[PDB]
Amino acid sequence: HPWKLSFKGSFGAHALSPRTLTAQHLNKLVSVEGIVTKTSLVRPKLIRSVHYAAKTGRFHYRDYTDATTTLTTRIPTPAIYPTEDTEGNKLTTEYGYSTFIDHQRITVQEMPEMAPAGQLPRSIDVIL
């Protein structure tokens, strides 16, 4: 089980609007406010597969990872969506036991009540 945190603040003079964000503030912990546009659609992401075998009758198993995982880095190893184990047997997949976890990204513009007189806005984007 994950048991994540929050960090409600009170932040340390990192109260900055996304006009003044980049780039020597990079890879730190930053608090940003603004308007939300242009929120995309909700799509489910795959993590763990489960396969039924025929005819020996054993389930199987596989994991998957990405770059938007926990915040460190890791030497990446891709992994084919499996089929035909050793020895050669058809692997009919399944659903219902294979997990799925949702995913959504929104972008943030700076505030119009806080903006300069007339200039183009500049914006960043957030993964949830």
Binding site: V42, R43, P44, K45, L46, D66, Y95, G96, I101
Partner: protein, 154 residues
């Protein structure tokens, strides 16, 4: 996104129901020299035709034959897709109705008239796609809803 695979039930108003056109399931070739009938199953959206032979007689010989298809020996199935919009009575205070696709196969076709109130019950599968190439993180899946049995109000 934790119901993928179960057998659920929705309700809403059908909008934009399309036409009925045949979609292929297995494709039947003839070999003309060996005399076999080499089948092929198609699961995906797009397929590709094939070449010389894959039998047990036009294989292990020097002179492979050449095969070409035929349409009175394949297996077809009707196919029609539509969309469910939210009922607009079961919404929170400040929101907008969403949507969710439906494929329909087989005998159940021609029972989805536009502008109704319906209770579709079906199972809920994935089907692979993501949008722009620069937005993918792997292995985003983009769901739909298979249909099983359709019960109308009114």
């Amino acid at each position: 996104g934790d119901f993928l695979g179960q057998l659920i039930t929705v309700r809403g108003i059908i909008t934009r129901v399309s036409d009925v056109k045949p979609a292929v399931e297995v494709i039947a070739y003839t070999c003309d020299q060996c005399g076999y009938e080499v089948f092929q199953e198609v699961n995906s959206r797009t397929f590709t035709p094939l070449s010389e032979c894959t039998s047990e007689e036009c294989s292990q010989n020097q002179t492979k034959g050449q095969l070409f298809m035929s349409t009175r020996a394949s297996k077809f199935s009707a196919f029609q897709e539509c969309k469910i919009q939210e009922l607009s009575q079961q919404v929170p205070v400040g929101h907008i109705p969403r949507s969710l696709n439906i494929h329909v196969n087989g005998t159940l076709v021609r029972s989805l008239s536009p502008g109704d109130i319906v209770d579709v019950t079906g199972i809920f599968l994935p089907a692979p796609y993501t949008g722009f190439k620069a937005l993918k993180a792997g292995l985003l899946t983009e769901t739909y809803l298979e249909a099983q049995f359709v019960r109308q109000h009114k």
